[PDB]
Design a protein around this ligand. Sequence first.
Ligand code: RYR
Ligand code: RYR
Lengths: 236, 236, 5, 5
Amino acid sequence: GAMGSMERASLIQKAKLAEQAERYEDMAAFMKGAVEKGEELSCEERNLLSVAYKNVVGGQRAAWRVLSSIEQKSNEEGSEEKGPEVREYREKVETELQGVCDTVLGLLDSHLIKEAGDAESRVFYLKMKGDYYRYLAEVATGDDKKRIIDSARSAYQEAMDISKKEMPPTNPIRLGLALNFSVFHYEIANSPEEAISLAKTTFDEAMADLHTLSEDSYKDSTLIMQLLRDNLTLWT
Amino acid sequence: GAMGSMERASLIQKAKLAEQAERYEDMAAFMKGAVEKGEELSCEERNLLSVAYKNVVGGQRAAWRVLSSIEQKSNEEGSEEKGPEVREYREKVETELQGVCDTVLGLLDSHLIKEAGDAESRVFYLKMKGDYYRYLAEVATGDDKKRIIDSARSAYQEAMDISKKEMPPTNPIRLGLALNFSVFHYEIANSPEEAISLAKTTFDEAMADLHTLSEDSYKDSTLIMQLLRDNLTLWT
Amino acid sequence: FPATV
Amino acid sequence: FPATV
Ligand SMILES: CC(C)(Oc1ccc(C(F)(F)F)cc1)C(=O)Nc1cccc(-c2csc(C(=N)N)c2)c1
Ligand SMILES: CC(C)(Oc1ccc(C(F)(F)F)cc1)C(=O)Nc1cccc(-c2csc(C(=N)N)c2)c1
């Protein structure tokens, strides 16, 4: 690791600077270095890690979608052959995306998840595991596509089971997990009815628990609840 | 060069794909590979090259400014020492920026400028040379800061001299050169009066030549003329 | 796209 | 910032 010689605290500080500078590849490298120091991550640090890689892979996903769309048009009946270049470059971006996903999954497996005992850390990491298998599933086409999908499902399901036992229904981690698992059902698993059921039940159970919350916790929970509603509006 | 095995035409095609995907680092690498094939660049290809590196260095400049601002606040009377990290990371971004500038300047010197005989190509490349020395000047602080500034000035001046002899006053390359040389005067050379004079004279001479233009050429010229006006409004 | 966080 | 192209 090229960050092995830098202090953990300096890596975290520089991750925060990189975020302010919108340098998310640097942010991700700094937070990978911090994870590789071997200590557990605090709540703030977990969110720095997730923000960094979400921005990196989010850009890769957007590029992949543009290129895949161009590639499909080039393969429609009537298109003028423009050679291997579109496929090659889509493949290049796809391989870089898979590499980022594999890196994140590797950090979770070595050894963030196995040391995560509290619900807020363990659910957070298992949600990430589901998310990054989901991104692999978005581009998968081979002998292991079903196994990638099932790896996403299994991670989301373990996270869900813990969240329902250990977190209130308004906990924003629980809400964001359900939001993303619902999108997994809709977009990956071809299970729109499960997606809709999960989003609606999550929203309604959260609504009923809002009365227990402070103003600041209310704002956090209702933010994610609005995303659940937005998706339900898109889907119904 | 890692692009040495790819066809020139494939590099150009992939640069255009990278642009559509907003993958400007890839775009720049593809266009560097195309330049290194040793052939002159067409008008479209020159603009692909400039668009790619402008986006790459533009992001680096924005990050550098954020970090420099944080660094200056940390060095105000009353700040809590937060160690070497802000300076280190600003330096890291600065070195990467200087590397990109050196790469572009290297392509212009080996051998785009010396083979550029037509005004539209030669003025274009000399403007780029001024621009990338200007970006080096923005971060320079050492024994060579004045020499960097004079390298920018010299390149802009040669471009200006050719443009006034060989291009009409509405030519968008001539206009964009004057726009940027004017910003050089204002922001780098501490010569705001020269900046204002150059922008105003360029604008007025272009205005008087608009009557010669087609509708499409008119739109191109008036676009840059509006940028000259915008800067004059900022400065007066 | 649908929303994810 | 001032405009450049
Ligand atoms: C998006 C939003 C509003 O809500 C979320 C995010 C993630 C999840 C899920 F993925 F866990 F499900 C659910 C809701 C959020 O970011 N909340 C949040 C909560 C706690 C800490 C931080 C934070 C600390 S540091 C830092 C930084 N960007 N520097 C950001 C941010
Ligand atoms: C910004 C704008 C509107 O005007 C300019 C640009 C540069 C200059 C100066 F730097 F030369 F001074 C002056 C005005 C512009 O981009 N004009 C333009 C003109 C000619 C060709 C292209 C083009 C071909 S391909 C391609 C692509 N992005 N794929 C873009 C674009």
